[PDB]
Design an enzyme around this catalytic site. Structure first.
Site, PDB file in Angstrom:
ATOM      1  N   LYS A   1     -13.777  22.833  25.149  1.00 63.22           N
ATOM      2  CA  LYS A   1     -15.121  22.247  25.163  1.00 63.22           C
ATOM      3  C   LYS A   1     -16.127  23.037  24.306  1.00 63.22           C
ATOM      4  O   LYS A   1     -16.968  22.439  23.638  1.00 63.22           O
ATOM      5  CB  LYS A   1     -15.603  22.074  26.606  1.00 63.22           C
ATOM      6  CG  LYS A   1     -14.779  21.045  27.377  1.00 63.22           C
ATOM      7  CD  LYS A   1     -14.641  19.695  26.652  1.00 63.22           C
ATOM      8  CE  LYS A   1     -14.482  18.546  27.639  1.00 63.22           C
ATOM      9  NZ  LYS A   1     -14.192  17.234  26.960  1.00 63.22           N
TER      10      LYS A   1
ATOM     11  N   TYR B   1      -9.778  24.621  29.270  1.00 62.17           N
ATOM     12  CA  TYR B   1     -10.801  23.595  29.206  1.00 62.17           C
ATOM     13  C   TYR B   1     -12.110  24.156  28.617  1.00 62.17           C
ATOM     14  O   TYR B   1     -12.720  23.519  27.740  1.00 62.17           O
ATOM     15  CB  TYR B   1     -10.999  23.031  30.611  1.00 62.17           C
ATOM     16  CG  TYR B   1     -11.895  21.826  30.738  1.00 62.17           C
ATOM     17  CD1 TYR B   1     -11.416  20.533  30.558  1.00 62.17           C
ATOM     18  CD2 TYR B   1     -13.213  21.982  31.138  1.00 62.17           C
ATOM     19  CE1 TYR B   1     -12.246  19.424  30.726  1.00 62.17           C
ATOM     20  CE2 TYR B   1     -14.043  20.892  31.285  1.00 62.17           C
ATOM     21  CZ  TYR B   1     -13.574  19.631  31.076  1.00 62.17           C
ATOM     22  OH  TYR B   1     -14.466  18.604  31.303  1.00 62.17           O
TER      23      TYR B   1
END
Lengths: 291, 292
Positions: free
Chosen positions: B166, B162
């Site tokens: 991001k 993640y």
């Protein structure tokens, strides 16, 4: 301090350029080096002859680093040589295009070789070190040197894919540093510039004396990699270094430029809009998250 | 100014939670909204009824945003509605695991939905706007709102996938902002916190407005979608509660420059080891809790 005798390193993208130089530099410091690249590139490379000349043992393992089987074989090969101490994720390709012209394949290829390749080998190494520490006294020697770029910080107009891969690599490295710290393992990222056959288009050919070094020699980068691979860097974890020439820059974390806090428990949309619009109307044009 | 009447927005991950809230918010401000999510999720959602209630037109397009057909259909749909003005890339999934236990599938799925999904729709929109400006007077209205996370800045121990996705998104956004600026398009990223069905695990249930209401995030998205934000391009905003934090670019902490034209390895080693000797282990490239 810097002696790597008795240690085993894995270097990806090692047939040429910076990876080749890193593999040779680690060999000179005393490491046994497992070099990885695409088969054709390995076949035409002098890297094994140079590792030998440096006084160490080298082994070549061909494969696409974006494929699971490659990272598996690299760790298995290292284990057979007595263990895995040092990982340098360097492999990469560019497929530059301005975003509105970029194909799915150009995006995907860059993400796969840089970001997935870094993931597979870092994850494999992490699992290996965790298991080794569990079988031993709860600690293990380990170093991860990952290759980011100033592109991850700036999002270049011709490099949306490469910038995204390199920014992802930085964050992956930070997470790896967090996960591995308690086992004694350290993980850091470098953002290098160095003149090679691949970068000749960007930097031009080598300039000019007896004793002088090319300002963009791979040597400048390799000297930092040698430190980051060594016991000497035990105190260095979760850092990002820019490196080229006789200069190493330690990068500071992002900070808050400005906090905009409402008077009440929520911003009225008109109030936030006027506030932000008016702040930006009197603010520098080039100023943003890009470094 | 803030009025989005006459404009068409596309919002991904719009069946529930933050994406649903953003779609409703853009509708309230006057936009026609094309909502995208996975088929089953859209089929069960009230988002179209809420768009209709806000007084605007909504159209649902099902698809996996990580697959090319989806971004293609979204832009085609917006074109059929009169044009494409606003893209909010919000779709995402988490597959949290500490790095040494993360599977290839966990890594790839997150990269695909977040980073590939963002790429496909931002690239399709970029191509559309470039073509539209060429066919017109060299300008076109456009706004991209992409969804990063504080995880992109901190590299959380449980979220290597993640965090990487991001951070990737933020760089992609910076590049899009540079590519599109000259046509009048603006692209920016947000790093939100909001309480939803999906974040109930982390944040808890709701305890005046909820300090983690989606409303807080939607208010910023409304601005970034609007003419009012013409002066805002290539920025990263953290947003939750009644606070918005504009993030500054990284700086140099320290330059280590050799006395001569190259560092001697032993010299660089002693220099760096001495510098790191009494260092807070938290001091590094990770940034945390910047709102505070």
């Amino acid at each position: 301090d810097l002696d790597l005798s008795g240690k085993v390193a894995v270097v990806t993208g090692a047939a040429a350029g910076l990876g080749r130089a890193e593999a040779i530099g680690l060999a000179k410091a005393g490491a046994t080096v497992v070099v990885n690249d695409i088969a054709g590139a390995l076949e035409g490379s002098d890297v094994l002859d140079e590792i030998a000349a440096a006084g160490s043992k080298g082994v070549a393992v061909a494969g696409d680093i974006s494929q699971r089987s490659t990272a598996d074989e690299l760790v298995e090969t290292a284990e057979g040589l007595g263990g895995l101490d040092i990982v340098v994720n360097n492999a990469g390709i560019t497929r530059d295009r301005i975003l509105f012209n970029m194909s799915d394949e150009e995006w995907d290829a860059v993400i796969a070789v840089h970001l997935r390749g870094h993931f597979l080998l870092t994850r494999n190494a992490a699992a290996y070190w965790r298991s080794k520490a569990k079988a031993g006294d709860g600690t293990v020697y380990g170093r991860v040197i990952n290759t980011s770029s100033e592109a991850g910080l700036s999002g270049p107009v011709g490099q949306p894919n490469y910038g995204a891969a390199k920014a992802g690599i930085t964050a992956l490295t930070l997470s790896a540093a967090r996960a591995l710290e308690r086992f004694g393992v350290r993980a850091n990222a470098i953002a290098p510039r160095a003149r090679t056959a691949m970068t000749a288009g960007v930097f031009g050919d080598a300039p000019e004396a007896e004793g002088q070094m090319d300002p963009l020699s791979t040597d400048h980068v390799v000297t930092l990699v040698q430190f980051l691979a060594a016991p000497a860097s035990e105190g260095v974890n979760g850092q990002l270094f820019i490196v080229y020439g006789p200069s190493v820059t330690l990068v500071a974390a992002p900070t808050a430029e400005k906090q905009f806090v409402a008077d009440e428990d929520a911003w009225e949309p008109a109030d936030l809009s006027v506030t932000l619009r008016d702040y930006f109307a009197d603010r520098d044009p080039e100023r943003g998250f890009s470094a």
